[model samples]
Target chain A: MNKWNYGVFFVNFYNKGQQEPSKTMNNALETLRIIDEDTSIYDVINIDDHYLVKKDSEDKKLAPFITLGEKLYVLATSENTVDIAAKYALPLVFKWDDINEERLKLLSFYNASASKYNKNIDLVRHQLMLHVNVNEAETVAKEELKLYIENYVACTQPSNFNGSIDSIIQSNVTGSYKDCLSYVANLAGKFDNTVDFLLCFESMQDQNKKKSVMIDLNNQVIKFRQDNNLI
Target chain B: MNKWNYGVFFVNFYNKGQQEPSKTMNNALETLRIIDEDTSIYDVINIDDHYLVKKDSEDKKLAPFITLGEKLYVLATSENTVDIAAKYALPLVFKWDDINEERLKLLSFYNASASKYNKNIDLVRHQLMLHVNVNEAETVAKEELKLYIENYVACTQPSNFNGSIDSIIQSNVTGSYKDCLSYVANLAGKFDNTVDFLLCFESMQDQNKKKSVMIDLNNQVIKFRQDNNLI
Candidate 1:
């Protein structure tokens, strides 16, 4: 009976402070408001881990989300961030890539909080990449994965581009649909079925490529649901 | 106030008996009874995941643990296991090593259960190795790790260890006491501080070596508690 519900990790409008902090908060709040008014597509609104509260806001900035009654999760990967999330009883959303030791450490801190407060703290995790074959998805995913790494390195690295890349590649899911299903199932097994996860698709700027990838992924999800008797 | 408690992953006496299951259940129950009577050390009694309820037994074999007011957890590492655990609202123990994707899937299943049942499912994890340097403990740990791996491979391979051994090594803590402290702290942080983890020390067949490792680790835990203000 423990069926999973899915959520969206909104783009971090709250980061960069590119605009007035209040204005940024309002904009994000409006997006959530609209989603609440207009959609049943997403069950959760995942805030970015570093979405800071403005130093001089009249209100606590995120008051609307709490009032909206949607399950709001703050994204977190570090122990300190989890502490921040715990104080408010906001479930955490982790963008897991690798470093199992580090991940476990984060959970330990969360567990400590739950025990002390006698409150249950919920968790959600996101994988940045998943490419499941409807048929021959590996070859397709491999090429896209290469581009992803290159783009990632280009965006984040200096002229040197010397960062280790293999770990990043291995951390992702790129294989047959069945393997992908097993991978997802194994993750569910490890936490005793307590944490939720979202599969992240790379946003290819090319609309055609992006749409095709989405369609294929949609089929995979449908297949997955049918196989798991979720349908 | 969210202090993480500790537990033992007791050997499964039940695994040997498919017939006359009550005998196996009683044996485990007696063990738990003695620990309850003889010690104040542990907060939970971990049962093997496959510990089954007999089809024809007059009563549920696990009733004594409930009567004793002991927290009962089942050891599991697959999605199917979380389902089994969910049936009884049991906490789960995972022997975690690498594969972040797999681990998340396990948690996801638990999350699903919690959402559906509106109940909390606790987690315990076991890290199969640790080295806490009272002073320069990593050096001692590394040599021991080599022997551990050799013995492990000798005992379990040729059938193809097939398992990722590097993840096993990395999952363990082997470094300065400060690093081990941080590692444990980090694990606590991840799940809102609900999961408790066990560090499995390798038992060198030689009593002196085993006792020395125990002494060193005991001291490390003491230092860790004091430094964290847990005292």
Candidate 2:
């Protein structure tokens, strides 16, 4: 199991004298804190959360995404960046100013994906996933995923075979559920929406919430295969 | 043209408060300078160079590769890392101590190419490639590459197709060609050795030199597809 996680947040590099993180950074922190609440009885690392504040000015760009590369460094900077990043022991924080516009751009990209900039959001997800290095081999296998989906859709929609959702990894599926998390991390890698969708699944309690996420994940995988002409 | 390129290098983070980069860092810098020599008449950003200083103190670990995550960060820190990284205006420098061992581990991983650690080098390559955010839809398309290789390999081996390497993109492939570079970048993404091989190709100039690099790139792509069972 890859027991790694990332807590990515951005700050106002311009606030040189101020020691506090930016309001946007705090928003993510608060979200994580709420997520931590679920850990009282369940492990909520599955929930991925990040927050960004928009530029109040007329500029519509979200704070600089790292994918902006070297140029963004010129955009988002301060001694404050290193200082705040140090506080969390992060290697570095990559971002820039006017996050509001960028945020909308990201959502828009998610809704209608294309173009160079649109792909950066996907790059963002890919980078974070690399940081986690999550592997799904043990949690779920390809066969199990197919079976679970087959059994699942059999009940609600018309399909080939029928079995209960809990048939194979019955214990985790109903009781102390997990492993399905592995399945999800794999499927979610494709879409920005799916990446956010994963956050919802992770913050939930036990197993029932995973039902929709799992089915959608299977559907997305097939759709992706079709989209890319993948076998 | 997608003008993005990366200059990835490592250093001895333990040497704190020292205004100079480590000997290892200097080695790669010198190599870059040598590659720069070709700029007298040709461009040399094609060559990729990085350096590492090794530990003599009996610990067989390379300075840490960033993929080690937080643990390695904890291991490879000093005010030195930030200071040296700052010197270059790089967003951050990621690495740890014991360069010699890690260097070999990387090469070994490149050869065997499996396991968690083995994949980290691939991750390292992948991350940098993401940072570069290279798109190969231009330069060389899927059809061009297939044609170029099919033309070249047709000779010296028993193949069905025959055409000149210079046929498709006659200019850069022969005269003032460049788009082949995009092809090389796409093909080189698969193997660690190929990554280095790209550096060798990049350092060269004009057209004829790209011939071998282009052919091998095509071969490697074919081999990779066969290995992964990709169509």
Candidate 3:
């Protein structure tokens, strides 16, 4: 019954003044855009706002990160940087600059299943799901994801009490699904990747194609909720 | 040779039941114990490593003053919160939690001085001075601060330039000898009433004897450098 959904994006300061398809951030952005298209989710757009830029180098590195003690430093690029983030509880992402083209081809199959269950009503309802903060939404989204993968594998494999993929799904289905009543259900790492991608895409598409983006994201969350029967 | 030296403190997670603070942070423990008596420089020791006590507080908000995104929020608190500090290339004074009363006083002084002069240091050496990170340091530490105030009041109270209390110091051979640099530098607002009492003593010991709780802080900095030269 939460009324709004939200997701976040980290602005790659390295690409601020560069041309479109920026060398550093484009791949991450594209992956996000594709996932948003498939799942219908909205993204939150934010730029790092804690620094006081001095000159015109136009890079995040030149920007000094403020410490609790109020000192500033330059080499604060890693997502794992603790001092600043933990002190403030900032949400963040992990990224690799390059795509494994061969692995991406295998990953394409995963996106195919997205539309298999999504109906118009589901697409609308799911957008409502995304308005939650990153931590809460991620919890729910991850569980459904594990269920989605096992369910996908279950249809093709027999449900024998053996060490097969079907059996793994069956075991988790009994245990994880019971806790599905809470947001702490099991979900695959793939779901996390997809959610991140969609969120980033919506973030970039702001101002243009706004309504369609919202509707598409809404439907994706709705399908996810209906899939879980919470809708 | 330069008159000052630098040292850093390291804080890490420790299992208290598993190990003792003395055994775990040997260097920090040594640095702090002898700091006041022998040298002015001392790093901090963090003590929240007890697991038995921590285990019960599962939902306790992780300390925002320290952790963010699995990273320690030391440099900028987090990448997300680094923007404002980065832009301004802000200086900081990382410290222990109890160090807040001191830092708050420092920050209030800093805020009052914000619009005037900017008061920052350049990375490379400038022709006028030869201290590493010292342009702003001198500003913060009250160097040239005495002169800056005299000049400021001279402009505003031009009629009182020759005869008033502000100009009285300039004419005297040994003007305002024992007046606190902190008190003179940060005279605006009600802070003067709160921190003005310690200036009455001649040295750190004298102040400690008088106030019991108070110590000669700036004197400690100078004494530490004189004694330890290599710090």
lDDT of 2 by residue, B25-130 (tens): 3333343443333222111122111222222223332222221111111121334433332221222222211132232243333334333222322222222211
DockQ of each: 0.01, 0.01, 0.02
Q: Estimate each model's TM-score.
A: 0.34, 0.24, 0.23
What lDDT tens digits, residue by residue, belong to model 3 across residues A1-231? 333334433322221222343432434444444434544344333222222222222222221332211111122233234222322222222221112221233233323333343412222111101111111233543344333333333222333424543323222211222243232122223333232221322222222333444345467567776776664
lDDT of candidate model 3 versus the reference: 0.29
Stretches of model 1 off by over 4 angstroms after superposition? A8-69, A96-101, A121-140, A153-163, A203-231, B1-231
> What's model 1's overall lDDT?
0.43
Model 2 misplacement above 4 A: A1-102, A105-212, A220-231, B1-102, B105-212, B220-231
- The lDDT ranking, best first, is 1, 3, 2
